[PDB]
RNA sequence: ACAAGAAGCGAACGAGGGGAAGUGAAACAUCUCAGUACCCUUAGGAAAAGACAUCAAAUGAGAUUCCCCAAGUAGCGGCGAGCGAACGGGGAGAAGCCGAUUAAUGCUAAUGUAGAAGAACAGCGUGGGAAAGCUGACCGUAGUAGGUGAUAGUCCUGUAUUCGAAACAUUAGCGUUAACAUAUUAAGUAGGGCGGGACACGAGAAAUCCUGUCUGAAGAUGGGGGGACCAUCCUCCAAGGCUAAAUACUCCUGACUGACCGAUAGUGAACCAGUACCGUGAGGGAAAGGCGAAAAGAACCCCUGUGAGGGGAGUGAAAUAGAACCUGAAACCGUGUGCGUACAAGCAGUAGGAGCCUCAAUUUAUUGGGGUGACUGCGUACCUUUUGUAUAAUGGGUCAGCGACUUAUAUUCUGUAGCAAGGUUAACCGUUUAGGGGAGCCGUAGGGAAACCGAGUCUUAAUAGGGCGUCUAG
């Protein structure tokens, strides 16, 4: 029962090369270079999937810091004010209010400013 | 046909018992004047092969 | 059976054999469970029954003892519970042979107290232990 | 137990041979061992010693800059020997006598349970004619079946020797695969008694 | 000086004359490898052996050979590594003789080497083509064969079945002829010393067989053997020659088969292969299959050098099926389109992300899919080997194909199945996966070196003590 591996090898190698499309040079053409580029891409994606949550919080905090400083206090005093006023609004929503509706954020800072 | 070979020299020193193997003790062939008579008395007779060592005896003597 | 399709081995009967060196996911890739560079990792490796790496092996630190007896290999011990295979009432050496209780080359036999007889027997030329003798005659047997 | 033949006569068969149980694990092993006994296992391949030539070292060990080689018939090389080349081997297994007997008891009992056994008083053909037996199977409502009789006739053999899914066997040459492969089994009453005694 | 033979070549198997070393012993010399490889001589369809100067020690058996057990037992062994019986039991085959020889010839019978006959299907639709679809028939002692323009029991060759031989081998039976052979009971023999060899047995307490050397009987009122040796008993008569079968094998011939390969496989060799090629030589040793159903293999015209190559035309179902011809992957190399890219430093991706381009809806830039990726963050390949590798440590130019835990037996444990204090047969026979075959093996009892005793036994003066066992599942 001789088994020829050409057919299964072809679609196996093709599966890796299809996943390596858009890569430069040998990384999208030859399997030996493409297989470890696909693995490395998956490793970056797994780590960057944690770092994304880490990077957007930095973005929200900076946006909130700009908004609070435009009218009144800083971010460090803003978060303390929201915490003392029992305001649960997340930094994601706050940064969206600051960047897209400045009247509401002005009213939102006042509630934090009167609480300290 | 091809059978497993007994270690014919390990069969001359180990004997099958019910739950293990038995054997003589060493240090009893010669120079015996200097040994206390407790050694001459308690080195005389049978002991059991140790649990540690009876896997080797099973591999050496597969048919006993 | 129903059909040659729905004939199954009865789960637990069959187990998949182990194939060494077939990739990371199989659990036996790249070494076959052999470990790293060493004598036991090499192609013709073996454990060598009777070897401790150089110290005189256990079977050579201890002395040889005893001798083999030729009588012991022609004397068979017979149990009371094996006597149900005998045809008739006589229990002799030739009668134990045709019952396939003892080997055809056994010269003499001994009946020991292992099980219990169910019918009267007549023993002619076989030695009977003290415990077996009282069990024989308790069932109506005799020894001659 | 109590079965009825085609005409209507009452035939009683022992439960120990026709109503036992279905042991699928037992039946599978005996059936699959029969199929392994059909193999003849005649094949081979060349090892390093067997391939033509390849006795000399193709080049010196050191200096050339090539991977070291000891033979051109190495299993690594094209045209080289097979590492672990196949040889002829025996595929027949041992089925215990009681295991074979028990499997046939299980199969026959299961054949009755799914209405695949047909008892007939006798099945004889006057002439060695395929048409005569094809017509007799139609009235028996078994166009494709396995006929089991004692002393298979010398003209009943010829009648069934051409019909596609039809075979006529002696009770002493009935195998476990034949009882399962065919859609129906037409056993004569005389042949059913033989299985009653032999199982 | 006249007739008859021989010579040489060619597979394996046999018999015989010589006879290693690698290796293992974790070194190595005894030993192993192994009486193997190899060399040499020589035969037959087989060879050899073969009828007791054999075993056995039972109630005895009754030549040789081969198989399953006995048994990895008894033994041998730097008692190491290893080597390794026999008795006897179950089978196959059986046969015993004094020419069981060889070679011809003639009848008788049967094969073999060419052959012959050999059933039964139409219509319609699709299709290049019907064997496939639908409807309805027929043969079958012929229904799973190979083909035929796609898959056919009824188209062809075939198959089941029934049979032919002028001629010449072959096998067997009878008769005849001519070549050889036809012992008559066994002395340089048995035995012995010395040195070796073979026996499972390495000098060992070493029986038995062989013999280079030196010797050397008795001779049925006798002699050989029964594993040192002696006695008793049992058995058998060497020093004459034969003898079928069961057994070993394949250069081959036929029939048949394959959970064997399918062109890097399978023979080295599917092909003009032991070729080309390499070597003084012995010797080594490749690569290389496929148009199409049918060549219908492209008349003719055009460009070109009356070249290559192509474009038309034509053939074909198909011509990116056009002869480097089925399919036509990847590496690798071009052409076209869209987007990005010439102020920016690194494993080239990843997570975000503007812009642009392109399709589908949608009442019309709103989403969704696809391509691209300005800009930002993070981010030093893989394997191996290591305490530790981005490592300036190893390996890989790439792609495709191939490439490494097998097989046989023994044994142990686990699972599962059947039976279960029992389980199971092996070789064989068999009309052959059945059925028979119970020889044997394991389990059911252990203690002790052993005799021996036995749920006990051993040690001991001990009934004390202690060791090993005991109060089931195989």
PDB file of N, CA and C in Angstrom, chain D residues 1-67:
ATOM      1  N   UNK D   1     -36.142 -20.877  18.382  1.00  0.00           N
ATOM      2  CA  UNK D   1     -36.997 -21.932  18.915  1.00  0.00           C
ATOM      3  C   UNK D   1     -37.898 -22.527  17.843  1.00  0.00           C
ATOM      4  N   UNK D   2     -39.178 -22.169  17.884  1.00  0.00           N
ATOM      5  CA  UNK D   2     -40.167 -22.711  16.956  1.00  0.00           C
ATOM      6  C   UNK D   2     -40.268 -21.784  15.751  1.00  0.00           C
ATOM      7  N   UNK D   3     -39.750 -22.240  14.617  1.00  0.00           N
ATOM      8  CA  UNK D   3     -39.827 -21.516  13.360  1.00  0.00           C
ATOM      9  C   UNK D   3     -40.773 -22.232  12.405  1.00  0.00           C
ATOM     10  N   UNK D   4     -41.227 -21.495  11.397  1.00  0.00           N
ATOM     11  CA  UNK D   4     -42.116 -22.020  10.372  1.00  0.00           C
ATOM     12  C   UNK D   4     -41.406 -21.976   9.031  1.00  0.00           C
ATOM     13  N   UNK D   5     -41.416 -23.097   8.319  1.00  0.00           N
ATOM     14  CA  UNK D   5     -40.859 -23.123   6.980  1.00  0.00           C
ATOM     15  C   UNK D   5     -41.828 -22.478   5.993  1.00  0.00           C
ATOM     16  N   UNK D   6     -41.403 -22.413   4.730  1.00  0.00           N
ATOM     17  CA  UNK D   6     -42.168 -21.690   3.716  1.00  0.00           C
ATOM     18  C   UNK D   6     -43.547 -22.312   3.532  1.00  0.00           C
ATOM     19  N   UNK D   7     -43.604 -23.641   3.421  1.00  0.00           N
ATOM     20  CA  UNK D   7     -44.889 -24.308   3.240  1.00  0.00           C
ATOM     21  C   UNK D   7     -45.784 -24.133   4.461  1.00  0.00           C
ATOM     22  N   UNK D   8     -45.213 -24.234   5.658  1.00  0.00           N
ATOM     23  CA  UNK D   8     -45.982 -24.036   6.869  1.00  0.00           C
ATOM     24  C   UNK D   8     -45.701 -25.062   7.947  1.00  0.00           C
ATOM     25  N   UNK D   9     -44.868 -26.051   7.633  1.00  0.00           N
ATOM     26  CA  UNK D   9     -44.545 -27.088   8.602  1.00  0.00           C
ATOM     27  C   UNK D   9     -43.788 -26.497   9.785  1.00  0.00           C
ATOM     28  N   UNK D  10     -43.986 -27.099  10.952  1.00  0.00           N
ATOM     29  CA  UNK D  10     -43.396 -26.619  12.193  1.00  0.00           C
ATOM     30  C   UNK D  10     -42.047 -27.294  12.405  1.00  0.00           C
ATOM     31  N   UNK D  11     -40.990 -26.490  12.464  1.00  0.00           N
ATOM     32  CA  UNK D  11     -39.646 -26.961  12.773  1.00  0.00           C
ATOM     33  C   UNK D  11     -39.164 -26.228  14.017  1.00  0.00           C
ATOM     34  N   UNK D  12     -38.637 -26.978  14.978  1.00  0.00           N
ATOM     35  CA  UNK D  12     -38.135 -26.413  16.222  1.00  0.00           C
ATOM     36  C   UNK D  12     -36.624 -26.561  16.264  1.00  0.00           C
ATOM     37  N   UNK D  13     -35.932 -25.444  16.458  1.00  0.00           N
ATOM     38  CA  UNK D  13     -34.479 -25.406  16.478  1.00  0.00           C
ATOM     39  C   UNK D  13     -34.000 -25.023  17.869  1.00  0.00           C
ATOM     40  N   UNK D  14     -32.867 -25.591  18.271  1.00  0.00           N
ATOM     41  CA  UNK D  14     -32.342 -25.346  19.605  1.00  0.00           C
ATOM     42  C   UNK D  14     -32.000 -23.875  19.789  1.00  0.00           C
ATOM     43  N   UNK D  15     -32.274 -23.360  20.988  1.00  0.00           N
ATOM     44  CA  UNK D  15     -31.930 -21.984  21.311  1.00  0.00           C
ATOM     45  C   UNK D  15     -30.428 -21.802  21.473  1.00  0.00           C
ATOM     46  N   UNK D  16     -29.712 -22.854  21.863  1.00  0.00           N
ATOM     47  CA  UNK D  16     -28.271 -22.774  22.052  1.00  0.00           C
ATOM     48  C   UNK D  16     -27.518 -22.541  20.754  1.00  0.00           C
ATOM     49  N   UNK D  17     -28.161 -22.747  19.606  1.00  0.00           N
ATOM     50  CA  UNK D  17     -27.519 -22.561  18.316  1.00  0.00           C
ATOM     51  C   UNK D  17     -28.256 -21.605  17.395  1.00  0.00           C
ATOM     52  N   UNK D  18     -29.482 -21.203  17.725  1.00  0.00           N
ATOM     53  CA  UNK D  18     -30.255 -20.345  16.842  1.00  0.00           C
ATOM     54  C   UNK D  18     -30.936 -19.186  17.555  1.00  0.00           C
ATOM     55  N   UNK D  19     -30.800 -19.068  18.873  1.00  0.00           N
ATOM     56  CA  UNK D  19     -31.417 -17.975  19.596  1.00  0.00           C
ATOM     57  C   UNK D  19     -30.553 -17.404  20.701  1.00  0.00           C
ATOM     58  N   UNK D  20     -29.231 -17.445  20.532  1.00  0.00           N
ATOM     59  CA  UNK D  20     -28.335 -17.187  21.654  1.00  0.00           C
ATOM     60  C   UNK D  20     -28.323 -15.733  22.114  1.00  0.00           C
ATOM     61  N   UNK D  21     -27.773 -14.840  21.297  1.00  0.00           N
ATOM     62  CA  UNK D  21     -27.561 -13.441  21.656  1.00  0.00           C
ATOM     63  C   UNK D  21     -26.841 -12.818  20.467  1.00  0.00           C
ATOM     64  N   UNK D  22     -26.679 -11.502  20.496  1.00  0.00           N
ATOM     65  CA  UNK D  22     -25.801 -10.828  19.546  1.00  0.00           C
ATOM     66  C   UNK D  22     -24.632 -10.230  20.317  1.00  0.00           C
ATOM     67  N   UNK D  23     -23.471 -10.861  20.190  1.00  0.00           N
ATOM     68  CA  UNK D  23     -22.216 -10.338  20.717  1.00  0.00           C
ATOM     69  C   UNK D  23     -21.482  -9.706  19.542  1.00  0.00           C
ATOM     70  N   UNK D  24     -21.631  -8.389  19.389  1.00  0.00           N
ATOM     71  CA  UNK D  24     -21.017  -7.707  18.256  1.00  0.00           C
ATOM     72  C   UNK D  24     -19.498  -7.758  18.330  1.00  0.00           C
ATOM     73  N   UNK D  25     -18.935  -7.612  19.530  1.00  0.00           N
ATOM     74  CA  UNK D  25     -17.486  -7.680  19.675  1.00  0.00           C
ATOM     75  C   UNK D  25     -16.961  -9.059  19.303  1.00  0.00           C
ATOM     76  N   UNK D  26     -17.699 -10.110  19.658  1.00  0.00           N
ATOM     77  CA  UNK D  26     -17.288 -11.462  19.297  1.00  0.00           C
ATOM     78  C   UNK D  26     -17.451 -11.706  17.802  1.00  0.00           C
ATOM     79  N   UNK D  27     -18.572 -11.267  17.231  1.00  0.00           N
ATOM     80  CA  UNK D  27     -18.821 -11.482  15.809  1.00  0.00           C
ATOM     81  C   UNK D  27     -17.804 -10.722  14.970  1.00  0.00           C
ATOM     82  N   UNK D  28     -17.491  -9.487  15.365  1.00  0.00           N
ATOM     83  CA  UNK D  28     -16.554  -8.685  14.589  1.00  0.00           C
ATOM     84  C   UNK D  28     -15.182  -9.343  14.519  1.00  0.00           C
ATOM     85  N   UNK D  29     -14.696  -9.874  15.643  1.00  0.00           N
ATOM     86  CA  UNK D  29     -13.363 -10.466  15.657  1.00  0.00           C
ATOM     87  C   UNK D  29     -13.291 -11.710  14.784  1.00  0.00           C
ATOM     88  N   UNK D  30     -14.320 -12.554  14.825  1.00  0.00           N
ATOM     89  CA  UNK D  30     -14.303 -13.768  14.018  1.00  0.00           C
ATOM     90  C   UNK D  30     -14.456 -13.430  12.542  1.00  0.00           C
ATOM     91  N   UNK D  31     -15.331 -12.477  12.220  1.00  0.00           N
ATOM     92  CA  UNK D  31     -15.505 -12.066  10.829  1.00  0.00           C
ATOM     93  C   UNK D  31     -14.235 -11.415  10.303  1.00  0.00           C
ATOM     94  N   UNK D  32     -13.655 -10.502  11.081  1.00  0.00           N
ATOM     95  CA  UNK D  32     -12.474  -9.793  10.609  1.00  0.00           C
ATOM     96  C   UNK D  32     -11.254 -10.707  10.557  1.00  0.00           C
ATOM     97  N   UNK D  33     -11.229 -11.767  11.368  1.00  0.00           N
ATOM     98  CA  UNK D  33     -10.165 -12.757  11.259  1.00  0.00           C
ATOM     99  C   UNK D  33     -10.334 -13.634  10.030  1.00  0.00           C
ATOM    100  N   UNK D  34     -11.575 -13.896   9.622  1.00  0.00           N
ATOM    101  CA  UNK D  34     -11.804 -14.633   8.386  1.00  0.00           C
ATOM    102  C   UNK D  34     -11.341 -13.829   7.180  1.00  0.00           C
ATOM    103  N   UNK D  35     -11.561 -12.516   7.202  1.00  0.00           N
ATOM    104  CA  UNK D  35     -11.139 -11.670   6.095  1.00  0.00           C
ATOM    105  C   UNK D  35      -9.623 -11.567   6.022  1.00  0.00           C
ATOM    106  N   UNK D  36      -8.952 -11.530   7.173  1.00  0.00           N
ATOM    107  CA  UNK D  36      -7.496 -11.540   7.191  1.00  0.00           C
ATOM    108  C   UNK D  36      -6.930 -12.866   6.707  1.00  0.00           C
ATOM    109  N   UNK D  37      -7.670 -13.960   6.871  1.00  0.00           N
ATOM    110  CA  UNK D  37      -7.265 -15.227   6.306  1.00  0.00           C
ATOM    111  C   UNK D  37      -7.452 -15.340   4.814  1.00  0.00           C
ATOM    112  N   UNK D  38      -8.171 -14.399   4.201  1.00  0.00           N
ATOM    113  CA  UNK D  38      -8.265 -14.369   2.754  1.00  0.00           C
ATOM    114  C   UNK D  38      -7.033 -13.805   2.088  1.00  0.00           C
ATOM    115  N   UNK D  39      -6.277 -12.974   2.800  1.00  0.00           N
ATOM    116  CA  UNK D  39      -5.049 -12.417   2.258  1.00  0.00           C
ATOM    117  C   UNK D  39      -4.021 -13.515   2.033  1.00  0.00           C
ATOM    118  N   UNK D  40      -3.235 -13.369   0.971  1.00  0.00           N
ATOM    119  CA  UNK D  40      -2.120 -14.272   0.749  1.00  0.00           C
ATOM    120  C   UNK D  40      -0.771 -13.632   1.028  1.00  0.00           C
ATOM    121  N   UNK D  41      -0.710 -12.307   1.136  1.00  0.00           N
ATOM    122  CA  UNK D  41       0.457 -11.615   1.643  1.00  0.00           C
ATOM    123  C   UNK D  41       1.740 -11.888   0.896  1.00  0.00           C
ATOM    124  N   UNK D  42       1.674 -11.879  -0.427  1.00  0.00           N
ATOM    125  CA  UNK D  42       2.823 -12.170  -1.275  1.00  0.00           C
ATOM    126  C   UNK D  42       3.307 -10.864  -1.884  1.00  0.00           C
ATOM    127  N   UNK D  43       4.403 -10.342  -1.350  1.00  0.00           N
ATOM    128  CA  UNK D  43       5.031  -9.118  -1.826  1.00  0.00           C
ATOM    129  C   UNK D  43       6.389  -9.024  -1.156  1.00  0.00           C
ATOM    130  N   UNK D  44       7.245  -8.171  -1.705  1.00  0.00           N
ATOM    131  CA  UNK D  44       8.543  -7.904  -1.105  1.00  0.00           C
ATOM    132  C   UNK D  44       9.107  -6.644  -1.735  1.00  0.00           C
ATOM    133  N   UNK D  45      10.126  -6.092  -1.085  1.00  0.00           N
ATOM    134  CA  UNK D  45      10.881  -4.955  -1.587  1.00  0.00           C
ATOM    135  C   UNK D  45      12.349  -5.192  -1.271  1.00  0.00           C
ATOM    136  N   UNK D  46      13.221  -4.479  -1.974  1.00  0.00           N
ATOM    137  CA  UNK D  46      14.650  -4.663  -1.786  1.00  0.00           C
ATOM    138  C   UNK D  46      15.163  -3.793  -0.649  1.00  0.00           C
ATOM    139  N   UNK D  47      16.008  -4.376   0.192  1.00  0.00           N
ATOM    140  CA  UNK D  47      16.724  -3.631   1.211  1.00  0.00           C
ATOM    141  C   UNK D  47      18.030  -3.098   0.623  1.00  0.00           C
ATOM    142  N   UNK D  48      18.914  -2.615   1.491  1.00  0.00           N
ATOM    143  CA  UNK D  48      20.230  -2.161   1.055  1.00  0.00           C
ATOM    144  C   UNK D  48      21.039  -3.304   0.466  1.00  0.00           C
ATOM    145  N   UNK D  49      20.946  -4.485   1.071  1.00  0.00           N
ATOM    146  CA  UNK D  49      21.679  -5.637   0.572  1.00  0.00           C
ATOM    147  C   UNK D  49      21.117  -6.145  -0.747  1.00  0.00           C
ATOM    148  N   UNK D  50      19.830  -5.918  -1.005  1.00  0.00           N
ATOM    149  CA  UNK D  50      19.153  -6.576  -2.112  1.00  0.00           C
ATOM    150  C   UNK D  50      19.261  -5.820  -3.427  1.00  0.00           C
ATOM    151  N   UNK D  51      19.392  -4.493  -3.391  1.00  0.00           N
ATOM    152  CA  UNK D  51      19.436  -3.718  -4.623  1.00  0.00           C
ATOM    153  C   UNK D  51      20.751  -3.990  -5.348  1.00  0.00           C
ATOM    154  N   UNK D  52      20.715  -3.892  -6.675  1.00  0.00           N
ATOM    155  CA  UNK D  52      21.886  -4.171  -7.492  1.00  0.00           C
ATOM    156  C   UNK D  52      23.010  -3.180  -7.206  1.00  0.00           C
ATOM    157  N   UNK D  53      24.236  -3.697  -7.135  1.00  0.00           N
ATOM    158  CA  UNK D  53      25.405  -2.858  -6.960  1.00  0.00           C
ATOM    159  C   UNK D  53      25.472  -2.192  -5.596  1.00  0.00           C
ATOM    160  N   UNK D  54      26.053  -0.998  -5.581  1.00  0.00           N
ATOM    161  CA  UNK D  54      26.146  -0.192  -4.375  1.00  0.00           C
ATOM    162  C   UNK D  54      27.033  -0.745  -3.282  1.00  0.00           C
ATOM    163  N   UNK D  55      28.151  -1.362  -3.644  1.00  0.00           N
ATOM    164  CA  UNK D  55      29.039  -1.942  -2.658  1.00  0.00           C
ATOM    165  C   UNK D  55      30.183  -1.036  -2.257  1.00  0.00           C
ATOM    166  N   UNK D  56      30.632  -0.197  -3.175  1.00  0.00           N
ATOM    167  CA  UNK D  56      31.764   0.689  -2.939  1.00  0.00           C
ATOM    168  C   UNK D  56      31.269   2.004  -2.352  1.00  0.00           C
ATOM    169  N   UNK D  57      32.146   2.662  -1.604  1.00  0.00           N
ATOM    170  CA  UNK D  57      31.896   4.011  -1.104  1.00  0.00           C
ATOM    171  C   UNK D  57      31.933   4.998  -2.263  1.00  0.00           C
ATOM    172  N   UNK D  58      30.865   5.765  -2.507  1.00  0.00           N
ATOM    173  CA  UNK D  58      30.837   6.623  -3.705  1.00  0.00           C
ATOM    174  C   UNK D  58      31.946   7.660  -3.764  1.00  0.00           C
ATOM    175  N   UNK D  59      32.372   8.204  -2.629  1.00  0.00           N
ATOM    176  CA  UNK D  59      33.510   9.107  -2.585  1.00  0.00           C
ATOM    177  C   UNK D  59      34.129   9.015  -1.201  1.00  0.00           C
ATOM    178  N   UNK D  60      35.312   9.607  -1.054  1.00  0.00           N
ATOM    179  CA  UNK D  60      35.992   9.600   0.234  1.00  0.00           C
ATOM    180  C   UNK D  60      35.182  10.373   1.266  1.00  0.00           C
ATOM    181  N   UNK D  61      35.388  10.035   2.542  1.00  0.00           N
ATOM    182  CA  UNK D  61      34.571  10.625   3.597  1.00  0.00           C
ATOM    183  C   UNK D  61      34.762  12.132   3.699  1.00  0.00           C
ATOM    184  N   UNK D  62      36.002  12.597   3.655  1.00  0.00           N
ATOM    185  CA  UNK D  62      36.315  13.992   3.919  1.00  0.00           C
ATOM    186  C   UNK D  62      36.962  14.643   2.707  1.00  0.00           C
ATOM    187  N   UNK D  63      36.753  15.950   2.584  1.00  0.00           N
ATOM    188  CA  UNK D  63      37.458  16.739   1.600  1.00  0.00           C
ATOM    189  C   UNK D  63      36.635  17.242   0.435  1.00  0.00           C
ATOM    190  N   UNK D  64      35.689  16.437  -0.047  1.00  0.00           N
ATOM    191  CA  UNK D  64      34.970  16.803  -1.264  1.00  0.00           C
ATOM    192  C   UNK D  64      33.942  17.899  -1.026  1.00  0.00           C
ATOM    193  N   UNK D  65      33.508  18.096   0.213  1.00  0.00           N
ATOM    194  CA  UNK D  65      32.467  19.053   0.512  1.00  0.00           C
ATOM    195  C   UNK D  65      31.055  18.531   0.382  1.00  0.00           C
ATOM    196  N   UNK D  66      30.881  17.235   0.167  1.00  0.00           N
ATOM    197  CA  UNK D  66      29.572  16.616   0.049  1.00  0.00           C
ATOM    198  C   UNK D  66      29.227  15.864   1.323  1.00  0.00           C
ATOM    199  N   UNK D  67      27.930  15.661   1.529  1.00  0.00           N
ATOM    200  CA  UNK D  67      27.472  14.828   2.631  1.00  0.00           C
ATOM    201  C   UNK D  67      28.079  13.439   2.512  1.00  0.00           C
TER     202      UNK D  67
END
